[PDB]
Fold:
Amino acid sequence: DVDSTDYGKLTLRFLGTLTRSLKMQNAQIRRIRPDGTVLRYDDQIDIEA
Amino acid sequence: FDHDHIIRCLMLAAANYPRLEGIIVQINTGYVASANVIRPVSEKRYFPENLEQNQSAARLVSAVKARASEADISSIHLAIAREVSPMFNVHELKKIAESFEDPSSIVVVLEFILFALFFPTEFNRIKGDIQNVLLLFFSRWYPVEYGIFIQRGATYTINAAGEFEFSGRNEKWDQSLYLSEHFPALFSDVPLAGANTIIAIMRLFTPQGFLRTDDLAIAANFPRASRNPQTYIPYTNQRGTVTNEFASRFRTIVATLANVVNERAVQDDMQKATRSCTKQWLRHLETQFDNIAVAHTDHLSVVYATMSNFMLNFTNNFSGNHATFKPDQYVITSPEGSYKPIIERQGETVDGLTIIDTSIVWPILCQCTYPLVRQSIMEEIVYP
Amino acid sequence: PSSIVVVLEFILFALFFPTEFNRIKGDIQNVLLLFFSRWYPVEYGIFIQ
Amino acid sequence: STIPADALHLHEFEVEDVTVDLLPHAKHTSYSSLAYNMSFGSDGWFAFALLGGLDRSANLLRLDVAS
Amino acid sequence: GFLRTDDLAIAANFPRASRNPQTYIPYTNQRGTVTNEFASRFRTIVATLANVVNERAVQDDMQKATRSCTKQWLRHLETQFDNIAVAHTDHLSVVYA
Amino acid sequence: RFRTIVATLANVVNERAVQDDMQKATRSCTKQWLRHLETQFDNIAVAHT
Amino acid sequence: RQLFFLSDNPVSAERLVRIPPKYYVSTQCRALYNIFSYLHILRSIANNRGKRLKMVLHPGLIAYVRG
Amino acid sequence: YPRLEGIIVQINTGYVASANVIRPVSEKRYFPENLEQNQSAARLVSAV
Structure:
């Protein structure tokens, strides 16, 4: 049971319940074209994180 | 403070929990309301003296009082806080039902000019649904030059070689296609031979701001979702000036709009009195803008500056050009599943957060007192 | 155009009391530089040049 | 006996949630006791505040009629 | 409008009083457009009817207000036509078909 | 002297009001007042001078 | 004598009541709705919070003034 | 039987009324706002 301050309990019952809708298998963060294709990582556009 | 981890969990937290936009706006609304920045009052001044009771402008006073909502403070503070906040659910326009019959229907266009100057970031997010209203404006006032603009296209895309590939299809815009490669075509700012007036009026929606880097957020080593975190503050601080250089922009907008409403008036030979009461009202917006441009460009511009340095306002809001800017559409990809986009129109409101009300600029212009308009007491500005 | 009365307040104050007009002729400029900056915008930019 | 010449009441006002302005001469006659019943926060003061004003334009001509 | 053949009546072998049964539907279906091509016809009729009543009123040099209140009424009929022109061409046109 | 000041000021307000294309009635009633200052100036300048 | 400092004019009461402008239905009818706004403020002043009231009408009252 | 027009129209009327294609309402909108009052249009509003 995670650490939860008096404001954090107000946020967790606000979002608040569903998490299992997303596969997290080898998940990365990438941009997409506005067409819909997943772009590769670009060294000069995306952040290093 | 770990920069790599917090910006990495805030991209899961926007994908798993799309109600996170209601958290960051509520934190930003709590900073606007704690600054005592806009305080409503019960005195309307939408009209000058002896024009509301004038019988000639009775067609005009039914078009301003039908657009100007009451000054509710829970929505004016919400409208400021939506600007520097990140966008997770795609903002869509409150539906405006106008037919642009009369020359007193120029009020709806002046509603959009003030909403493009006061909130240029939130103008970009719904600039396409404003085209769906404005294409009913130009097609009933400039029918010769409307068809010249349509044959180029109602949407356009960006080529990889930097050109503007205009489509050529007369399509009503929807707020989906905001995530795709199509742009609104009125805001290209590309001149067209024959359609010189429509491009000229679209040069009045241009922003009057600058592009400030997050100098206090990078040195604090806060999470940011770009390489150079740069936000768009709507107007520069205007110290020591006799003539205010932001209020003088509205002088040159009305001086063009008083020529658009004049050519529409004399085309249908309406009364001298019903035309004079329009232009007296268009320069009553001249006077009431001079009273508040001292207090927007001195007291809001230090609030929009310091709200762009918060921990949770982690995305770029705007660049400075409506003709090229798109939000960086990150996703959470996965090879053994489907990618979940961050910015994704699904209508999942926070009970009124996605519906953008462009009638918020009529209380801001008229029935709101500011803590710098009153010089004659000194308010002793509340620093939160 | 009904605000020409404030200007006629200054003409009569310059004809009846020209000594006291001199002592506050600078504050009458501050009112009148709002007069000429709205009614004659082309000539105002030449004047403050 | 009801007349064809009255429709002409049957109109009723519905109260809303947003207030009036109070006509800045009401701050001046807030103090002190501009008439007897027009003491601060009374019916005649507030009617002089909300309804407001007296024109010169009407009852000069009526002051011109009865001469 | 357009001149439509009776495709579903000849296949039903219904009685018809001519060689090619061609009824006349008053206006085309107008899906998928921004401006209605049947409503813009009424625009170019009032724009012709504007110039007739404008030249007639100046022949009798009547008031500017009595002429503009005519022309404000003519394009008020534009606004009321544009609201109902979607429902005639989409839903009345299939009833005559 | 005040005759030739209002002869200028009734042309400044006339060049202004036709630019805002306002009524002949709202402009002529202003110019009826500008020459009403003429009649009230001609009466009291005998006692000033 | 009844209203010394209160206004004569029903013009001052039209500031206090909005009328949704589908009700303006005859040539004198703007000037008639003012007295409706004029009197009900003066009649009901002991129950005036300082809210702004709004007018609704019977459609026969719309029908009677058309003529 | 020249009354056969009365048969065929009554069937054709019976299809239109069954389609629920037009529902009348008791709200006039023959004029825009501030034109029926307007004294200059008194010759026009009587002919409409």
